[PDB]
Amino acid sequence: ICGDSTECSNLLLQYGSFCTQLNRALTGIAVEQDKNTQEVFAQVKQIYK
Amino acid sequence: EAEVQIDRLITGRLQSLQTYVTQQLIRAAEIRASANLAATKMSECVLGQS
Amino acid sequence: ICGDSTECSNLLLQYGSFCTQLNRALTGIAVEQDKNTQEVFAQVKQIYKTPPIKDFGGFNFSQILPDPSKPSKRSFIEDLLFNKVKFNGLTVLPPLLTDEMIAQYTSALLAGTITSGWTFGAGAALQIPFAMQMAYRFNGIGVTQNVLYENQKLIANQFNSAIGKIQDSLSSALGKLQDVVNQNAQALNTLVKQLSSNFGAISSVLNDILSRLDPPEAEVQIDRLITGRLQSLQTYVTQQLIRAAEIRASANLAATKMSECVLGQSKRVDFCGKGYHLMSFPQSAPHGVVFLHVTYVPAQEKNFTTAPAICHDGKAHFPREGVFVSNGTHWFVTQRNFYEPQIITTDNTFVSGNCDVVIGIVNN
Amino acid sequence: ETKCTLKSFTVEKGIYQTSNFRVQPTESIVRFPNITNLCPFGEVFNATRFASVYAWNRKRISNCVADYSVLYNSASFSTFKCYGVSPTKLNDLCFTNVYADSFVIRGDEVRQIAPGQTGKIADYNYKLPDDFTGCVIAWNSNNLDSKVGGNYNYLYRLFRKSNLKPFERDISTEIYQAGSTPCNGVEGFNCYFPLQSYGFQPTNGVGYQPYRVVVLSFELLHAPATVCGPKKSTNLVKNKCVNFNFNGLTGTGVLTESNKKFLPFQQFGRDIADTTDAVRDPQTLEILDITPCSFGGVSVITPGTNTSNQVAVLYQDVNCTEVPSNVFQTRAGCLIGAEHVNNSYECDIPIGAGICASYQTQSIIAYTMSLGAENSVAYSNNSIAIPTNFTISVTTEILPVSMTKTSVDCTMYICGDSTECSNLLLQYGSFCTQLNRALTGIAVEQDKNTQEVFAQVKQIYK
Amino acid sequence: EAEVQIDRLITGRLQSLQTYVTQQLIRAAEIRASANLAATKMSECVLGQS
Amino acid sequence: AYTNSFTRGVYYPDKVFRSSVLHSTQDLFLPFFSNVTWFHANPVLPFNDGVYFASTEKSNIIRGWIFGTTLDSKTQSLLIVNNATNVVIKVCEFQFCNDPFLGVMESEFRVYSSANNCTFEYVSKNLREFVFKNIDGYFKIYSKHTPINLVRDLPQGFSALEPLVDLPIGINITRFQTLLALHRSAYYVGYLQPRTFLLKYNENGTITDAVDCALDPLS
Numbered sequence A: 001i002c003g004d005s006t007e008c009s010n011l012l013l014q015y016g017s018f019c020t021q022l023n024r025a026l027t028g029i030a031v032e033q034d035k036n037t038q039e040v041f042a043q044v045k046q047i048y049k
Numbered sequence B, E: 001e002a003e004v005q006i007d008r009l010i011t012g013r014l015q016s017l018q019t020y021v022t023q024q025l026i027r028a029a030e031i032r033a034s035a036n037l038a039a040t041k042m043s044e045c046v047l048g049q050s
Numbered sequence C: 001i002c003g004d005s006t007e008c009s010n011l012l013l014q015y016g017s018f019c020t021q022l023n024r025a026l027t028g029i030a031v032e033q034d035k036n037t038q039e040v041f042a043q044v045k046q047i048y049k050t051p052p053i054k055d056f057g058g059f060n061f062s063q064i065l066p067d068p069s070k071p072s073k074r075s076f077i078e079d080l081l082f083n084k085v086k087f088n089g090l091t092v093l094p095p096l097l098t099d100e101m102i103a104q105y106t107s108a109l110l111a112g113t114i115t116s117g118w119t120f121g122a123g124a125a126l127q128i129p130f131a132m133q134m135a136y137r138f139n140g141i142g143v144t145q146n147v148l149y150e151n152q153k154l155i156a157n158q159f160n161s162a163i164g165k166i167q168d169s170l171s172s173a174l175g176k177l178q179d180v181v182n183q184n185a186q187a188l189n190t191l192v193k194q195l196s197s198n199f200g201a202i203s204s205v206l207n208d209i210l211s212r213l214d215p216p217e218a219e220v221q222i223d224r225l226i227t228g229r230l231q232s233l234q235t236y237v238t239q240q241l242i243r244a245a246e247i248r249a250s251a252n253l254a255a256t257k258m259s260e261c262v263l264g265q266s267k268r269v270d271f272c273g274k275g276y277h278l279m280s281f282p283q284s285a286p287h288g289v290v291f292l293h294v295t296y297v298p299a300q301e302k303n304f305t306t307a308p309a310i311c312h313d314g315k316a317h318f319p320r321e322g323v324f325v326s327n328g329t330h331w332f333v334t335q336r337n338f339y340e341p342q343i344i345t346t347d348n349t350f351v352s353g354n355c356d357v358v359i360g361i362v363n364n
Numbered sequence D: 001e002t003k004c005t006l007k008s009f010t011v012e013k014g015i016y017q018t019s020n021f022r023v024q025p026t027e028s029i030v031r032f033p034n035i036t037n038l039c040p041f042g043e044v045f046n047a048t049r050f051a052s053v054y055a056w057n058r059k060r061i062s063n064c065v066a067d068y069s070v071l072y073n074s075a076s077f078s079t080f081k082c083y084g085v086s087p088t089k090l091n092d093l094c095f096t097n098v099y100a101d102s103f104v105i106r107g108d109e110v111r112q113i114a115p116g117q118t119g120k121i122a123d124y125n126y127k128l129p130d131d132f133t134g135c136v137i138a139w140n141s142n143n144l145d146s147k148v149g150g151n152y153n154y155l156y157r158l159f160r161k162s163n164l165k166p167f168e169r170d171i172s173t174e175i176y177q178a179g180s181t182p183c184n185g186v187e188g189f190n191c192y193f194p195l196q197s198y199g200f201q202p203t204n205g206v207g208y209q210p211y212r213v214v215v216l217s218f219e220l221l222h223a224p225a226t227v228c229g230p231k232k233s234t235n236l237v238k239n240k241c242v243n244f245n246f247n248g249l250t251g252t253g254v255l256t257e258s259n260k261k262f263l264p265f266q267q268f269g270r271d272i273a274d275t276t277d278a279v280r281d282p283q284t285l286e287i288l289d290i291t292p293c294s295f296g297g298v299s300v301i302t303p304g305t306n307t308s309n310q311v312a313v314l315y316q317d318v319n320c321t322e323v324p325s326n327v328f329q330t331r332a333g334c335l336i337g338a339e340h341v342n343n344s345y346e347c348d349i350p351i352g353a354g355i356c357a358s359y360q361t362q363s364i365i366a367y368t369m370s371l372g373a374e375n376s377v378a379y380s381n382n383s384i385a386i387p388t389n390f391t392i393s394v395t396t397e398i399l400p401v402s403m404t405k406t407s408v409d410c411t412m413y414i415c416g417d418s419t420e421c422s423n424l425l426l427q428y429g430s431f432c433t434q435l436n437r438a439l440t441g442i443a444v445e446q447d448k449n450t451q452e453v454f455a456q457v458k459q460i461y462k
Numbered sequence F: 001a002y003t004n005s006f007t008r009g010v011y012y013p014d015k016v017f018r019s020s021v022l023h024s025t026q027d028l029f030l031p032f033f034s035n036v037t038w039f040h041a042n043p044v045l046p047f048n049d050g051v052y053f054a055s056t057e058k059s060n061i062i063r064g065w066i067f068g069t070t071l072d073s074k075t076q077s078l079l080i081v082n083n084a085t086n087v088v089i090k091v092c093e094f095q096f097c098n099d100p101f102l103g104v105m106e107s108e109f110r111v112y113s114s115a116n117n118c119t120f121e122y123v124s125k126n127l128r129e130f131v132f133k134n135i136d137g138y139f140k141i142y143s144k145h146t147p148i149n150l151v152r153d154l155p156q157g158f159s160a161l162e163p164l165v166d167l168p169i170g171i172n173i174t175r176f177q178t179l180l181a182l183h184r185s186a187y188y189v190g191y192l193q194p195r196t197f198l199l200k201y202n203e204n205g206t207i208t209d210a211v212d213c214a215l216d217p218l219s
């Protein structure tokens, strides 16, 4: 949003927790992508040869 | 005079980011339903006979 | 948005019907929460009760059967699970089924399966003694019935000792149920904490813009609050739709597992536990269900040497339902999952062809 | 009200949220703490000996509780004029400093104590600025200050070089010099002593008798605060939705006796999520909880207008004693217009917490839905049940495959054939391109949906 | 002064349209799960015995 | 000398009761583990943003402070004093001794030599902490009196400071001093900065612990 400027950050501080929610939403997505792969591929106890 | 314009810029740029995040949320639930189908296939077609 | 003030409420009329849509959305997701529970738990027509004298062949179900001296007539393990896990315009509606009703449903499922096997999920319940039901389930995984009947006390002791460990491991894990509670509370708190932001106004209180501003100047400041609060409410309502669509798929999987693991024996690999599925038992939890999966796991393997067929009198013989094995000097037939050698006869083999097209034939 | 909520003339069976119930606040109350320093004016308005007119006094009243009502209504004052501010609103304002000036003049000289006057008093004895703010009070004092033979102790200045600046004071006693001739500190023609004395005597006509005057001047420098009126306090009632104000805290709700213990400097308590939920009464210093005034949705239960026009009403999570026959209390609220029976049926219209309603027993009634009929299985350890016949069953199952493919032109929806609007819409970027791309991708998915269900066969078999 | 009034209409109508499109995207994902289940029933119940 | 505070200079940010609630605040605090001057027995110090101030004794050598910008006439200043009687707040224009103090016969007060234009009056071992701040023409004072089991060294521990006074003066402040009772017959000075803290509230509503959220990664 702002981006470097400082007149922008104090004005955006007036909107509450809108940016904390968005970062939580994106972090949940990123943690889900590793569990997707663990559930598909790590389906084996030993590494067989 | 400038605070008025900067608030318009802020409003637009926050709307864009909300659109982006909502669509990523809808698109990740579609990838999860696909990885769930893959896990069931790996269990039932690779670790057994169906 | 307004909090009982006619000035804000008249300005709000200029926004159309956004607030009838938001309520329609929340009502649509509050009705499907009761639809979710109805399809996991109301999978019986009758409420079955278990017999007073309980002799199930050495198997002991006392920690999962209902307990009258307990709260809500829950089982002993349903208690460990229930122990581990007013504002402005915000209310919480109660669920249609109480917890007592859901514990009643799971005790009817559990008394149906202990007593009739899988027959009550296909029609009228037909009773069968519990060890004969266990023998049918062993047949369903490809072991013969004498292997159950000759190992009854050992199989019953292993089952009792393994039900005793669930109770320790829980009494001493319900993170998937805790997370959905936490997410909903974290969202409801963020909704209320937004009632104290300006969004570019002189204050956050309507009794402060209606006290140091004349009506022509307070409209401009009230609209800045209206826009922000509408945005925040609509963000709350979108994220609830996206979270409810995920709870719905989980409940749809739970309803399939109740059908396929509790009212049947599944052959799907790793769908009702890890091993070979024997049977499953349901238990109710705060906003979900716990399945206890009982499976068979083979142990203590030996190697032998094998052949595909046996040549005799110029003919090739194949086993009817087993494998040919050799202990070093002699040749037997076993069943494939449990070692039990037999003499090769013309009753457990069949013939097809002459013994020069198969590769690996042995003479015997 | 249900027909209006649905916008129809036929409602089908169900349960509908129709409105809301909000208990109103009967009355309102205010409160504050007892008073201590209410300012003892009874020293400036109750002195035994006033001050001259040429050297007035100057008391600087300070942080206190000033009650200008005991002044305003005392009816003992012959003159009470207020200039910056009308008198009745004094006990409702706060300033930084109040000054009180005191002196004694003739009776008909009280009209020169006002902003913008002239005369021997206002010229050079006591001058009031032209934007005065305070009030001027004056009362006759013939019996105290006038004495037989003449009271020659009350002087005034009658010659000065130049009129005073406002609130300026001059107690010098130099020999005035009227003419051009220098005076050298001795009297004579055009060399006059500058002070004269009222010779007050008790047999003087009014307008010749001494009046005592007090000039209050409220000033507001730039401090943080100071003395002001004595904000009274009304009674306080509890256990009723009320509109309250606790020395600044404005709110609504039911007030109740508490059993928490603040620390002896804390005024009110807050909850998690930051809402005021306790206060301390300033006057009696006791803690009181603040609970919200009962409120909740209203739902209407109807068997359908094609069956009956009777109705039952649910007040959601409201205690059934504060709603404004059959009144029935539920874990889901208060139900009116249905009778509670002891039977148990299959659920018909879901109320909640295990309770359903039906139109059965020509009316409406509540009950704890039944899960099903009970059944003991004749289990023993050598008994088996084996079927001797069968039935063939056919049942249906219905599934949605597809929905309606719709598109919206984002530009024609918003502007609708208007170039003035279209060029302003270009300042938002790619919102309409995004919207059309989203809507088109779900129209393509719908044909894939029905290809995946129905085209599962290679040949057309007959 | 036409511009200041036109901008509020643009702002309101854009938000209306965005709400419509988001709720269509959430509903199409529910229809897709249903159609996948119906495809699986067609394969497993009509083209075989389950 | 210089010394290290450990967890010192926490005050209740305002009224409003409160219980067990790790409540988060942004305000002017004394950062944890800070560099606090040491004084023995004194000079003109700065103010610049609030002040922490502890002191230790059984007798009473510390007899108040004096504040302001110039500590003389031509501009206004505060004066807070305590003879063996009780506290005397005062706000005039003064003429302060460059080394002002009071004696201990028991005759004293060589502090100032002028008391003009007074705009506010008022009249009426051990560890005694004080927090002084000055916002929007109000001069706030928090304080706490804990008993040490030492005589004159800065101890360790947690103890929140409760508000005492509020003065709507308007005065500007840039400097301050101290006042001591002479011999005729130990104190520290921290400064406050804008920090963010996490306060733990008891069930009676007292602050029992805190976290300074800019000390280290764990915090």
Ligand SMILES: *[C@@H]1O[C@H](CO)[C@@H](O[C@@H]2O[C@H](CO)[C@@H](O)[C@H](O)[C@H]2NC(C)=O)[C@H](O)[C@H]1NC(C)=O
Pocket (backbone or CB within 6 Å): C060, C061, C062, C063
């Ligand atoms: C089934 O197992 C339970 C153990 O959970 C047995 O019940 C307990 O047995 C112990 C040992 O005698 C007693 O001390 C407890 O009082 C029993 N009751 C409890 C814990 O509620 C039970 O006896 C077993 N059933 C059979 C038929 O042996």
Ligand SMILES: *[C@@H]1O[C@H](CO)[C@@H](O[C@@H]2O[C@H](CO)[C@@H](O)[C@H](O)[C@H]2NC(C)=O)[C@H](O)[C@H]1NC(C)=O
Pocket (backbone or CB within 6 Å): C301, C302, C303
């Ligand atoms: C089956 O026979 C194989 C062949 O010897 C055993 O596998 C070997 O075991 C030894 C000792 O554990 C290892 O050092 C070898 O590396 C193994 N692999 C070979 C020799 O290829 C195996 O233990 C036997 N299995 C059972 C159940 O007895």
Ligand SMILES: *[C@@H]1O[C@H](CO)[C@@H](O[C@@H]2O[C@H](CO)[C@@H](O)[C@H](O)[C@H]2NC(C)=O)[C@H](O)[C@H]1NC(C)=O
Pocket (backbone or CB within 6 Å): C327, C328, C329, C330
């Ligand atoms: C393989 O199993 C056979 C069992 O049939 C073993 O042969 C018998 O062993 C017993 C006890 O050693 C003798 O009493 C019998 O006379 C044996 N022959 C028969 C026909 O029963 C044989 O020893 C086993 N081989 C190995 C390597 O363990």
Ligand SMILES: *[C@@H]1O[C@H](CO)[C@@H](O[C@@H]2O[C@H](CO)[C@@H](O)[C@H](O)[C@H]2NC(C)=O)[C@H](O)[C@H]1NC(C)=O
Pocket (backbone or CB within 6 Å): C311, C363
């Ligand atoms: C299995 O048995 C057959 C018949 O007894 C064996 O066939 C004989 O093998 C010998 C040696 O190779 C020949 O001289 C004979 O002519 C064969 N006869 C026939 C009818 O084929 C066969 O070799 C045996 N297999 C093994 C591995 O010993």
Ligand SMILES: *[C@@H]1O[C@H](CO)[C@@H](O[C@@H]2O[C@H](CO)[C@@H](O)[C@H](O)[C@H]2NC(C)=O)[C@H](O)[C@H]1NC(C)=O
Pocket (backbone or CB within 6 Å): D034, D283, D284, D285
């Ligand atoms: C405020 O004033 C009231 C009276 O105006 C005080 O009430 C008195 O309380 C004492 C209790 O210690 C009683 O013995 C008196 O009889 C009460 N007086 C009256 C007239 O009822 C009240 O105590 C005062 N507030 C405080 C904090 O002391």
Ligand SMILES: *[C@@H]1O[C@H](CO)[C@@H](O[C@@H]2O[C@H](CO)[C@@H](O)[C@H](O)[C@H]2NC(C)=O)[C@H](O)[C@H]1NC(C)=O
Pocket (backbone or CB within 6 Å): D041, D042, D045, D046, D070, D071, D074
């Ligand atoms: C000055 O003091 C006198 C005496 O205390 C006050 O006179 C009282 O006035 C009231 C109201 O007019 C009467 O009811 C009393 O009877 C008077 N006192 C006496 C002793 O009779 C007078 O109000 C005071 N002046 C001011 C300005 O407060």
Ligand SMILES: *[C@@H]1O[C@H](CO)[C@@H](O)[C@H](O)[C@H]1NC(C)=O
Pocket (backbone or CB within 6 Å): C359, C360
């Ligand atoms: C198995 O491999 C061995 C080599 O060690 C070979 O001699 C034999 O013919 C093979 N037998 C079969 C059945 O493949």
Ligand SMILES: *[C@@H]1O[C@H](CO)[C@@H](O)[C@H](O)[C@H]1NC(C)=O
Pocket (backbone or CB within 6 Å): D306, D307
């Ligand atoms: C609705 O009305 C029609 C005709 O009045 C009647 O045939 C039908 O049975 C009614 N439906 C119900 C549910 O009573």
Ligand SMILES: *[C@@H]1O[C@H](CO)[C@@H](O)[C@H](O)[C@H]1NC(C)=O
Pocket (backbone or CB within 6 Å): D319, D320, D321, D329
């Ligand atoms: C409603 O208020 C009465 C009076 O205090 C109380 O007895 C009753 O229990 C309340 N209702 C409920 C559901 O508790």
Ligand SMILES: *[C@@H]1O[C@H](CO)[C@@H](O)[C@H](O)[C@H]1NC(C)=O
Pocket (backbone or CB within 6 Å): D340, D341, D342
């Ligand atoms: C229902 O049964 C209970 C039994 O405890 C009885 O007390 C109650 O009066 C009955 N209700 C009615 C309406 O008869």
Ligand SMILES: *[C@@H]1O[C@H](CO)[C@@H](O)[C@H](O)[C@H]1NC(C)=O
Pocket (backbone or CB within 6 Å): F002, F003, F004, F034, F035
């Ligand atoms: C405090 O700062 C001074 C400045 O020179 C430094 O010498 C001293 O070591 C510091 N004290 C601590 C405890 O860091």
Ligand SMILES: *[C@@H]1O[C@H](CO)[C@@H](O)[C@H](O)[C@H]1NC(C)=O
Pocket (backbone or CB within 6 Å): F081, F083, F085, F086, F088, F123
């Ligand atoms: C204490 O000091 C104050 C400062 O003015 C003074 O007013 C007071 O009289 C002193 N105490 C005594 C007992 O004189």
Ligand SMILES: *[C@@H]1O[C@H](CO)[C@@H](O)[C@H](O)[C@H]1NC(C)=O
Pocket (backbone or CB within 6 Å): F116, F117
């Ligand atoms: C402050 O004192 C000085 C000297 O006593 C005086 O000249 C000045 O007028 C005083 N201030 C005011 C506001 O009277």
Ligand SMILES: *[C@@H]1O[C@H](CO)[C@@H](O)[C@H](O)[C@H]1NC(C)=O
Pocket (backbone or CB within 6 Å): F170, F171, F172
């Ligand atoms: C305090 O000093 C500053 C110096 O920059 C001055 O601008 C300000 O006006 C002073 N405070 C007041 C209340 O006058």
Ligand SMILES: *[C@@H]1O[C@H](CO)[C@@H](O)[C@H](O)[C@H]1NC(C)=O
Pocket (backbone or CB within 6 Å): D261, F202, F203, F204
């Ligand atoms: C204060 O807190 C203590 C411990 O937290 C508690 O035991 C006590 O009851 C509380 N109230 C008091 C001391 O009045």
